[PDB]
Amino acid sequence: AAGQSYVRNVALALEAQRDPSTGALPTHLTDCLSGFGQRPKTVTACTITYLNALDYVIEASLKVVYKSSDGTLT
Amino acid sequence: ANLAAGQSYVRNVALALEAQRDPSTGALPTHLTDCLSGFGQRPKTVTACTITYLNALDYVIEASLDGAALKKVVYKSSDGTLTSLP
Amino acid sequence: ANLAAGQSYVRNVALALEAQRDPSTGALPTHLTDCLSGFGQRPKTVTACTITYLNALDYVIEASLDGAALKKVVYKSSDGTLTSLP
């Protein structure tokens, strides 16, 4: 699971793009097939869902799910 | 670069805490409230460091710096913000 | 003096990272991979900043600058080199 590591790196990248005073994420960035460095070929689908301006869920098919709100990876 | 050494230490404490979450529930061990020790090398500019748990998922790190461009750093896990104050 | 401001920022990132080394082993925490925050005041010329760890001791900082005499600056801890105009 090179896929898991990629997902964690997408999350880290998203954390770095938060507004530094409010925490808000740009909520139109919903694709993580590109724009997050080298993607291992095992990752065939990657979407970011924003639940509000702070919280996101990354879903990747290789299925793995990262939730920013609780920091869990499944 | 004391302010930078302090801030970066705080970010490293947060990353360490993230790694210690329960992998199914996300819960943190909420008795770990001191960050003066237990998080690797602490730059000497950091003279106070406390972690406050607002619930089982969310924490706030507060650090005080000596001889730095600012005095207090606060990191909030819930919104991912880092603030620094004189 | 944007190139100078970006260069100065990168050097401050490096100095901050040095402060986090274990003083017996030299090892750094290797999950702090961006330097857009947590390293003091960042000049607005610095639009991207990443830290790559090549092993537990050695890192490379890459920063992208806009409106500067160079576009990218790179610091390597192993050789202490920083992009400089000849």
Residue numbers in the entry:
A (entry chain C): 41 to 102, 109 to 120
B (entry chain B), C (entry chain A): 38 to 123
Please give me the paper's original passages concerning this structure:
Type IV pili (T4P)1 are long, surface-exposed filaments which extend from the surfaces of bacterial cells. We identified a cluster of type IV pilin-like genes within the T. thermophilus HB8 genome, using the program PilFind. Three of the remaining six, TTHA1218, TTHA1219 and TTHA1222, yielded crystals of truncated forms which enabled us to solve their structures (designated here as Tt121836-123, Tt121933-236 and Tt122238-123).
Tt122238-123 adopts a typical pilin-like fold, with a central α-helix packed against a 4-stranded antiparallel β-sheet. There is a trimer in the asymmetric unit, with two Tt122238-123 molecules (chains A and B) aligned approximately parallel and a third (chain C) bound in the opposite orientation. Analysis of crystallographic packing by PISA highlighted the interaction between chains A and B as significantly larger than other interfaces, with a buried surface area of 600 Å2, 10 inter-chain hydrogen bonds, 4 salt bridges and a Complexation Significance Score (CSS) score of 0.4. However, such an inference should be treated with caution, given that we observed Tt122238-123 to be monomeric by size exclusion chromatography (SEC; not shown). Given the potential involvement of Tt122238-123 in natural competence, it is interesting that a closely related structure, as judged by r.m.s.d. after superposition, was ComP from N. meningitidis. The ComP fold is more extensive than Tt122238-123, with an additional β-strand (β5) and a loop which wraps around the back of the β-sheet (shown in red in Fig2e). The modeling indicated that the structure of Tt122238-123 could be incorporated into the pilus fibre model, although some repacking of the core helices would be required to satisfy steric constraints (not shown).
